[PDB]
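Consider the following assembly input.
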Amino acid sequence: XXXXXXXXXXXXXKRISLDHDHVKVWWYQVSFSWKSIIERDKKGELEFREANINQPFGPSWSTTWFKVKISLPEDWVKSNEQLLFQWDCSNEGIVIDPKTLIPVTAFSGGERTEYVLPKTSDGKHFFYIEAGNNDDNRFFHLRKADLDARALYIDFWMLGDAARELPGDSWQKHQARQLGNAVMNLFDPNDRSSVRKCRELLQREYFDVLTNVYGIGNCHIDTAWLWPFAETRRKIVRSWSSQCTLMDRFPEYKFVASQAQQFKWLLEDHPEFFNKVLIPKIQQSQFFAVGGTWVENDTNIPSGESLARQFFFGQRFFLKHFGLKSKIFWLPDTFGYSSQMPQLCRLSGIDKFLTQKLSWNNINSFPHSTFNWAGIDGSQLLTHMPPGNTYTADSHFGDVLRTAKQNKTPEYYGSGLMLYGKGDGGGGPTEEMLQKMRRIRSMNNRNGNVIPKLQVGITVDEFYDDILKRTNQGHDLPTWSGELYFEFHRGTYTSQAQTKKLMRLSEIKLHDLEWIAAKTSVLYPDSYKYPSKQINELWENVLLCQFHDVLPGSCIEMVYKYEAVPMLHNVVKECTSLIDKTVQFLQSQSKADLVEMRTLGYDDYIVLANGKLKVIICKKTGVITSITDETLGVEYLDFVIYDDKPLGWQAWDTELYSVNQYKYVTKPKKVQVSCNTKEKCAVEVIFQISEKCKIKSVISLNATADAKLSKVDISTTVENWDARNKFLKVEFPVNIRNDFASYETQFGITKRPTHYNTSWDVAKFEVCHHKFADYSEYSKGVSILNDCKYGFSTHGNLMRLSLLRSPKAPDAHADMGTHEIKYAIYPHRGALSSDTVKLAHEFNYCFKYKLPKDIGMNFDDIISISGDENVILSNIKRGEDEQSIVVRVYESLGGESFASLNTTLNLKRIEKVDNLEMKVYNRIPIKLRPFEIASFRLYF
Amino acid sequence: XXXXXXXXXXXXXKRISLDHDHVKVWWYQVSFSWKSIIERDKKGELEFREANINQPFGPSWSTTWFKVKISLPEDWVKSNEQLLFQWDCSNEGIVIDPKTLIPVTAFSGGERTEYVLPKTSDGKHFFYIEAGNNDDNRFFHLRKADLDARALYIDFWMLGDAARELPGDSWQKHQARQLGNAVMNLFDPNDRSSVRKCRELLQREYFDVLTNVYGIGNCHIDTAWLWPFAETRRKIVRSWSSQCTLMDRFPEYKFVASQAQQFKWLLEDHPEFFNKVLIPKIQQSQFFAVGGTWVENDTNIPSGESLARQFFFGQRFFLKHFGLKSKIFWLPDTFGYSSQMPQLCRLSGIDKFLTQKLSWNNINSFPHSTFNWAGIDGSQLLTHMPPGNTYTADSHFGDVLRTAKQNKTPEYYGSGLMLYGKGDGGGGPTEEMLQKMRRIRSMNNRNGNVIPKLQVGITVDEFYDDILKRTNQGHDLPTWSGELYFEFHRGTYTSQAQTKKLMRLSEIKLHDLEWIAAKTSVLYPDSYKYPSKQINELWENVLLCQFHDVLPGSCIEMVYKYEAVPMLHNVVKECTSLIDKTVQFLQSQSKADLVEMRTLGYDDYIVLANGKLKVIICKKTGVITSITDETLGVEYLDFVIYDDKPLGWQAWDTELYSVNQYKYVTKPKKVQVSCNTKEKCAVEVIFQISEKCKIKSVISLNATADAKLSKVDISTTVENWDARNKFLKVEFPVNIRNDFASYETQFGITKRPTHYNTSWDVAKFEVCHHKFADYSEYSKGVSILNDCKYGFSTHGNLMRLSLLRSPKAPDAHADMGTHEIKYAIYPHRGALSSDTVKLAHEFNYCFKYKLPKDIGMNFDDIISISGDENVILSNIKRGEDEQSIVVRVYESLGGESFASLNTTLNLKRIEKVDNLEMKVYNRIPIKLRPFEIASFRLYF
């Protein structure tokens, strides 16, 4: 059918010319800054040397600079020709043509790329290019030219490619075939006069339901990944330069940036001439900042304060010369989404959101891609969702009509959605031939509006103007309550808990000193008292490791050591330095000060004797048998049984072997008890397994009301040895029947069933959590507190916490070494149903005691008339510039009770203020809605 | 490709002979019993007259008898020929060849059918056949014959039909084509010698992974449907006779019967010779009784007592000569299934269940058709599920390989499942050519076991022996918690509430006198005291209208009048007669007796002033604005707003018009108040709509602690007029956020979300309920009590009760006429969370007061030491034969608390006994499991 005759023939087979200049070429390498090397160039004879040939290398962390001094050949003849220099793209680097140094040019784009030499100025210039190693040898040759001949070659390549994508039943496929025919006729027998003429004839063969197809070129950059931050800091400057050279070459282009800190990275590295580059670039057009967010992160693990700073400290750039923005919120690589996001968005002045994964196309009780998200708070979020092709559809895309068809099926709207650029790497490239892409697509389809029109230059702001018109304001709409569920690729989330232990301890610790440091305002006045400039710098370093890829611990071994480096550590070390600092001139009013933040036995007979409860491990079995309440009457049989099953997948996802029996840790145990006291009781029982390894958990608790508490504390200490690729968990089967699982999400409590959605794919079902998870019919249940482990699962009502994971990924630090784990099991009652939530989250508190000399009185309870047990205040902090402070509260128990808010203060005034710390004229609500975040601001 | 050459040719086109006997033929009709007409035949000249021709008719409820006296033609020649008489099947009737009357023969089979004349006895006999009218004229002609020639014609017809079903890619399709070729060769030119010879040649062309394909011929009969009970009582005797004549013709055949009462219907109508027919039939083989159930019904609407009697009173036949049974439970036409069924099955000694609808094939978190059902009680149920082809796959099936392929995909097992016979009609037919069906399918596939073997004679009992072997005992298995959800065809469930009002009032009323009538045992001894024989006859009539098709009210107009007839009415009338009877010699110990069963204002300012709560309707709007708790703090905005939307579908399913605006009942209302008192407060507000109709609801409640109660009572009285095809509902939006909806199912409380499963198809989502439905985060919520309406819906947390429905089905009584409706709205609190459930269900109680002369003392509280608020005792009754009584309890609140059971009695003993009232040796449990039915028995 002549299918392989037209397609594979001409696609393979003045005009393009290749000249070679061997001399004047220099090479440089550092085996030990662009401004530092410019002074080391002209002076004497340094490591800069003549290359003139291909330079091989070997694996190193070193970077290799390269210098090419080119003299323009002849005068007029080769000037009209297009000047070009081809380079082989290495792992990283930069390219410059500095005098002395004005420019910064793009590198990080794909292995194929073009560098244009200015035809405006006739003379000799210089070139500075470095190549990051990880080895990749560069192929460098000068390439002259024509533009019209190469255009036809590209247009034909995108022609026949579009012929294959078009339906064979349509006449267009037979048309495009005949179009690929006539072109091949004059193209074959090597004729320049025919090629240029045939290009004109092809255009004549080209030009002879309201819908729209658009796209926005973007670069998604991970600040920490298998390449480090310092190296990727050089990678982000390559993303800006590719646009700058594209602007003069092509107009109407659109770029978006998920990092507000990206601006600062460029302003710190290139403060001089590139601060004045951004202003005409951003203000006029062609640039948009999405979300104005300081960090792109997973929202499940951290608190709302992490989401509070990124909005506020990312809005700080708006105070500088900046501020052309968009209403879209972009978290493409983020796994999972919080249920408080619809509430956080509207308050942050951002009305749109984008989600890559976590969706399906079918009747789900859900129509399509485009979606209006209604959280459990009751608020609504209009969000724009890309199809199942994700962001890799338009990434490095020359295929034209290929994914255009697959985009139309999931989406209805009046139009589709395309995201240009790659989100996997040091940063995404932006192709320079996109100008022809938009043009050649306007060659196939006619102009005027009848058939869908092709415009790549439209902005999402105008796109959101279209959705406000076509579709109704709505009452009954696409509706999904809570979060979304698809293949999560949880992976490292529960793996390498040691980086969580450091972070989660640093999380609370940095969240510790915040508010109380504003309570010393009255004591010693200067600015009064608050580490405004001091704590601002603190949040700068912490948010850097909190990114979506970095925080769970999925990365190479090099940057993983930078996670356990002072980056995480010194934060705790500086905060523990400040907490011992501010105390000196403060606590001096305290003789003996207990510092805590709030606002108002037997062996053979196997018993630990007390009133509250009883939990018993059988003899020689090693497994807890009876957990039973006398007053309640609930008896348990199948507790705390540790289970170890291997893992055969990589760091990304988790895939267990087919029907693999999980090895129990039960063995010929021995019995022991740590101490002897009414205050302290710890009974020790040893567990062992094949390839002997010591797995230790501890038992701690306070009796009743001599010790006082309602909850046990069980901490696990395990030093891993030998066998890798294993996944360890501890089971807490409730032996109870409930279709609902109580779990506390970020700023609230979400309601999720015991069984996953019927559309679920992956066998293994695990859920990420903050602190505790419960099962409650409201008259009773079982509550499980935990530390350093964010994961858990619903087994058919068997509570299983994930202690450790060891992926087969190329990381050797995820396998062996000691670990300190902690968790708990708590008895549940209807009266204690609101108590278990209160005794869970903030239990991470660490007791600390210190005393100065005595002059004063140390008892002051300064909080004013609120007293709501159903509400919990997560964050209260100051401002930037005044020093007005903000107060943010959220209701713990919601969905049933309507919390009356009497919260107020004295000696000053108060007004309700959103999460962006921006002034809002409703006033303080006397009653809080269920599952509502209440944030306020305080002024003198 | 010669596809239509072989298939449509020979399929259309001594041997078959047609003779006509005009004389000796008689006809009979009753325009005004088989035993009554036999005495009216030979005597004188009655309405029995000579027919000899085709007799036309007209629509009537009459039945037309027919008599054919046939003399055997010649002697030997036409004796060897197969004697047959063809009849045109009418709506109903019976066929007999009585001397004087021995036989009863089958009729109700399809319009085509065969009646064989005995070749054993040479002589003259008689024929008695009646035809039910609803007119259908009968075509009657005597047909002689051969058996070998007709066999080839059938075998060839099932051959070419199997050729089309077989894949064209396989050689079998090309083979069967060539098989259809050679046969057509000798068949075409009218040769008897060739046909008989070619039949032998075809058999030679026939005969030349472990799996099994089986089936069981069955007849599903609805006792009340578009044809009445008295008429279908004649229809059930036609189902038995078709088997009896089939037994001698073909062996190994299997029949099953979902009705245990079906035996009694035959024993009452034919007590003499047909009581001795069943014993060799059932005992040896070929017959199985499924479930031993008295009735086949919807389990959602009635109580457990209805499910208790059907097992017990259906097990009464086992006491007679009976009792070859099966472990399968069959409810094919039943819409929806209870969650207590896994618990009820194991106790009833029945380990298997069958479900037609309510399933899907995909990964649902569910593998396949075959399923092990785990209820919310924790118990497991192994159930056998037919594919998506339901029971109509093998119904009237000559198509052979057709549905054989579609059966294999949903099911894995080692084998598939097929159900022969039709479940829609007066009763299902069983074809007589099934003998050849099993044989011809053994002609295509070889014998011995390699390929799947075809046996239609295997019993499900042996089938359950295979499932115990191949598959594992299991831990992780197919798992679905609670009920199942697919297209329900709710329909008449909420339509025609008047038949529910009569039944639901009769439900409780018949459930009333049961236990307390055993409490008078000591008073006047004879047998002591209990209506053992009296209340047994009561349950006989009531269960008759409780069937799955009859109870919801989906039926013709004729039997619908039989629903409102004394059948439902006299039950209440006889029970209200007995309650005024037994009182006379009982209550005489009571001077003044209050009889109840248990065991221990303003207008312009628009307010009804009291302490407990406040509910306000705005002026002129007609809609309730603020329902607010002061102590709790929950304020409501959007209550009790009646909504009317039309309906464009039939009685079966419910389909609303595409985006049709539901008309509000708001209008220029006027304000009024019924009475004036602290005891009685009713404020009246009128509603009206287009084509004016008076829609009235009432307001009743008791204040606090002069009136005392925690709950309002709102009863609706509406007389329908004019416009039909409408669906009326009243909305109670909570204005709250909950992912869970609290609802009390039969014997317990099931947990269902606010959103339907993602695999749901139909837009409109409505749920059937018993009494109340709630939404609880356990600290608060909203409780809705209702009467006579079993339906409700979850709108995104808007409570909507269905008042009335008017389908477009051919029933004129579902449209107009008055209706009395009642419901309620209740305030919810954590402490009252167990109270709302207690104040909901049994509120249907009706106050009654009567007094006799005074001698005695009327206060005795006889219950002994239980006192569990979380448990509720639904039923306690006596036995059959002694007169030992049984006690059945079930826990209301479960899934959280483990209820300690101290329940016991005095002066006698007690033992745990299952739902079948059969003696069980665990003893009385001291603690009850969550969601567990506890049934016991009491002996002297």
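The CA atoms of residues 784 and 825 of chain B lie 5 Å apart. Ask yourself how this observation constrains the way the partners meet.
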